[PDB]
Ligand binder design. Structure first.
Ligand SMILES: C[n+]1cn([C@@H]2O[C@H](COP(=O)(O)OP(=O)(O)OP(=O)(O)OC[C@H]3O[C@@H](n4cnc5c(N)ncnc54)[C@H](O)[C@@H]3O)[C@@H](O)[C@H]2O)c2nc(N)[nH]c(=O)c21
Ligand SMILES: C[n+]1cn([C@@H]2O[C@H](COP(=O)(O)OP(=O)(O)OP(=O)(O)OC[C@H]3O[C@@H](n4cnc5c(N)ncnc54)[C@H](O)[C@@H]3O)[C@@H](O)[C@H]2O)c2nc(N)[nH]c(=O)c21
Ligand SMILES: [Y+3]
Ligand SMILES: [Y+3]
Ligand SMILES: [Y+3]
Lengths: 300, 297
């Protein structure tokens, strides 16, 4: 049974970002303006066209689809096709109320690479963590069974070595070509890859092996069909591991941000302090203050 | 008006990309019309980008939505918009030939984690038996080919290399900038052949490579993603230079290795690349895949 936007009104302020290639758009709207003091609140609405489901496509092209002809020559031709309802799903995400840090992160990527030494991390990044980081209340809600409980795909309930595996916010669950799940560990205070030590190895292995095994049993998808990894920098500073279909070229799966869990585990087995000592490469917005901070602790 | 045929029986998904919301289908058409004898068609379908004004308008009309879930300030929904947002770009090849089929066909991939042993016992023996030609490299290195496009060359036979646009780039804009660097010293097959003796070749590549791109394109190093493939397609060490902003195919973690961390990895673990297990993806029909899977069963 269908619902409405969790707010009234939406008046466009700004296209934070759009991409014709990815068929996606992120908008900052003013909402609820006809109440209280008349200023309203900020929201972000994100609209993404969805992947095709080949069977519905094959069934459509078997009949007489609604078409207009755009180019014609001999054996080539391009139409505009207007499918029935069922092929038109647009994946819609709402952030509301949206904070100033949301508005910043969803804006116009003009990105710069940076190489962060262990020392740059203790000295510069760590003490500046608040400014990179978003509320993890949603993570607590899942771990506490207050949101998304009926979506949980698997749980290892151990307080220390356990975790919850659930469909990622980006996956609309309608097909397996873009399978995307997330594992969040039960244990609090592991912010990111920089916190990881051999003490976490049991936790890591369980995410890797019981996560893959749970995906094999739920979706029949084999581990050699999965790309399993973490982000550095993450947006939410509670360790989280991303399980994607390998043939899905997921945004954020690039060598400049993604780290395979299998390698992370073996890195720890070979090199207990590897994540505190070594240098990690990632991208930051041009104008992000932390970039400036870091550029200045290494140039001179 | 109409599709150029009647009936569609799916024969094969030649290629798909959920990320780009595109599929390439081969179907059999006309099987319940004319003589009864079906033909070949390719039909490519692609979702369209949004238009701001149509989206704004839809949103201020407060539409109805099917809730997927909510959590705190977050929520997601299925939206079934009115016709004007729903257009699909439908390209048809009819009748299509076996050439059209081969043009669009892509193999599905499979992950493998190749130990240092796996590489010694299985991949290396396989690759000396079977490899794609590295002539085209040779042609460049010794000026018979593409000398009209060199961006930079350091000639030192032991640590030098030539830097040319990759064929993937039409050179009309810097958005999708892509270059390869091929080294002068011969027989470096891939990453698996790298040791601390390579440190000058590597350093060389990264550093003079960036300087060349700076002077030629006005593009700073922090704007560049620089890396090698494992497994490469061509077994003569080759370094890839792409614009940071360009989400280049093949820059995924399951394939790409940052040049600079390959360097530091040599510095702290001299045997790294002969001992450590490396991860990569193979085509479903690659004989190497069956070999590795059989060795690890
Ligand atoms: C709030 N939240 C985030 N995730 C998922 O948790 C992971 C956190 O992962 P991470 O810490 O490594 O950070 P990441 O940067 O990947 O997450 P973010 O959500 O900021 O995604 C990165 C970028 O991808 C882009 N993007 C494409 N679609 C969306 C979308 N729908 N929402 C936000 N960003 C999107 C944005 O440009 C964004 O900055 C992400 O994969 C996110 O979908 C959630 N999953 C559930 N199940 N319930 C949640 O409530 C939830
Ligand atoms: C022949 N050639 C190739 N390159 C470029 O050299 C680099 C070699 O780099 P690499 O050794 O690590 O190989 P990579 O795997 O990147 O090569 P490429 O993208 O071309 O892969 C090879 C081929 O296999 C095909 N292919 C890739 N995946 C699939 C799949 N999944 N299914 C079916 N076919 C696939 C490709 O379309 C292509 O024909 C590539 O980035 C390539 O564009 C060249 N550059 C110049 N300047 N002059 C050349 O003549 C030249
Ligand atoms: Y006020
Ligand atoms: Y006011
Ligand atoms: Y079915």
């Amino acid at each position: 049974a269908p619902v409405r936007l969790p707010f009234s009104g939406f008046r466009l302020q700004k296209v934070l970002r759009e991409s014709a290639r990815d068929k996606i758009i992120f908008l900052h709207g003013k909402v609820n303006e006809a109440s209280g003091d008349g200023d309203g609140e900020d929201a972000v609405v994100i609209l993404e066209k969805t992947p095709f489901q080949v069977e519905q496509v094959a069934q459509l092209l078997t009949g007489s689809p609604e078409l207009q002809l755009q180019f014609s020559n001999d054996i080539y031709s391009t139409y505009h096709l207007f499918p029935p309802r069922q092929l038109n799903d647009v994946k819609t995400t709402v952030v509301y109320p949206a904070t100033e840090k949301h508005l910043q992160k969803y804006l116009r990527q003009d990105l710069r690479l940076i190489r962060e030494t262990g020392d740059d991390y203790r000295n510069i990044t760590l003490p500046h963590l608040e400014s990179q980081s978003l509320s993890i209340q949603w993570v607590y809600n899942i771990l506490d069974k207050k949101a998304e409980a009926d979506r949980i795909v698997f749980e290892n309930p151990d307080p220390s070595d356990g975790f919850v595996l659930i469909p990622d916010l980006k996956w609309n669950q309608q097909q397996l070509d873009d399978l995307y799940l997330i594992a969040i560990c039960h244990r609090r205070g592991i912010r990111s890859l920089r916190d990881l030590t051999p003490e976490h190895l049991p936790l890591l292995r369980n995410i890797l092996h019981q996560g893959q095994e749970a995906i094999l049993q739920r979706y029949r998808m084999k581990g050699d069909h999965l790309r399993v990894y973490l982000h550095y920098l993450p947006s939410y500073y509670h360790l989280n591991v991303h399980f994607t279909a390998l043939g899905f070229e997921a945004p954020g799966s690039g060598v400049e941000r993604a780290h395979l869990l299998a390698e992370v585990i073996e890195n720890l087995e070979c090199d207990p302090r590897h994540y505190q000592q070594r240098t990690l490469t990632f991208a930051l917005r041009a104008d992000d203050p932390l970039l400036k901070l870091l550029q200045e602790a290494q140039q001179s």
